[PDB]
Amino acid sequence: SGEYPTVNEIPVGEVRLYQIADGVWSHIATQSFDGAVYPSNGLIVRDGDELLLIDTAWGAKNTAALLAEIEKQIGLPVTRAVSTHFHDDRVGGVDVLRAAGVATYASPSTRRLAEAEGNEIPTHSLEGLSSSGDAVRFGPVELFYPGAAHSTDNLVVYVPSANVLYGGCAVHELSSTSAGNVADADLAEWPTSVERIQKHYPEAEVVIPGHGLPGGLDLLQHTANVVKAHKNR
Ligand SMILES: CC(C)c1cccc2c(-c3ccc(CS(C)(=O)=O)c(Cl)c3)c(C(=O)O)[nH]c12
Ligand code: NA
Ligand code: NA
Ligand SMILES: [Zn+2]
Ligand SMILES: [Zn+2]
What angle do CA 45, 56, 202 make, to 5 degrees? Predict the structure, then answer.
């Protein structure tokens, strides 16, 4: 169909790529957790004749399948990866990446939280992101720390050349009726953190959630709404 792939269309262990813009793809994979199956997204951004990866494909095998799918569909090497928070849908697979020669990065807060959780730990620390509103350049993207939301460490990623906003798990898809896995969230601060994203990236044309379908800027307000519905009741 060429439509964005959904959870029941991707067997656990396979990876799909979806072209978002020139030189920008999302990656989609599925994984089992506590007896249910979930989809999750990451990002791939062309960096000259190299690629920057945002987030693993949620597990070692899935991430190996991601590298194979990239080689098949794109044919450029992944040289660096950034994980946008400490959960396994973001760092599970970092050991696969590192063994494949990919330099792996995350904020110090993410690295500490991953270590404490028993999750895989990116090698290199990203400084300059410890205060809400901070932004740094990393290859062809900007990394932004909006404040605590889905997790205290969540980062968002903007691709200026394409006006693509990758919200990660701080941003939910439009069809969502709940706020996802809130175990490590700050539901009170989340709406303020979304407001920071909205103020910083008013020209975003595509917004990609951590799980589910991309859309436009409406995903940001929708996320604030579903988080309030959860917090309220
Ligand atoms: C801790 C990690 C590894 C993890 C494990 C298992 C599930 C999740 C979810 C998640 C995402 C979407 C929905 C559907 S929804 C918006 O509620 O309609 C649901 Cl149920 C759960 C998330 C997330 O929210 O980022 N993380 C998960
Ligand atoms: Na986790
Ligand atoms: Na959480
Ligand atoms: Zn998470
Ligand atoms: Zn998530």
Answer: 45
Please give the backbone phi and psi of residue 230, each rounded to the nearest 5 degrees, phi first: -65, -50
8 A C-beta contact, residue 119 and residue 106 = no
The token pair at 196 is 């920071």
Q: What is the resolution of the experimental data for this entry, in Å? A: 1.1
Q: Which method, experimentally, gave rise to this model?
A: X-ray
**Domain boundaries, position 73:** 1-233
* Ranges of H-type helices in 11-135: 60-73, 88-91, 94-99, 108-117
Which of 208, 211, 222 gets mutated to test ligand 1 (max ligand atoms within 8 A of its CB)? 211
Compute the distance from residue 72 Cα to the ligand 3 centre, in Å: 33
Can you say which residues are annotated as belonging to the binding site for Zn(2+)? Answer: 85, 87, 89, 125, 127, 150, 169, 211
Total structural domains within the chain: 1
Q: Is residue 175 exposed (0-12), middle (13-18) or buried (19+ Cβ within 10 Å)?
A: exposed
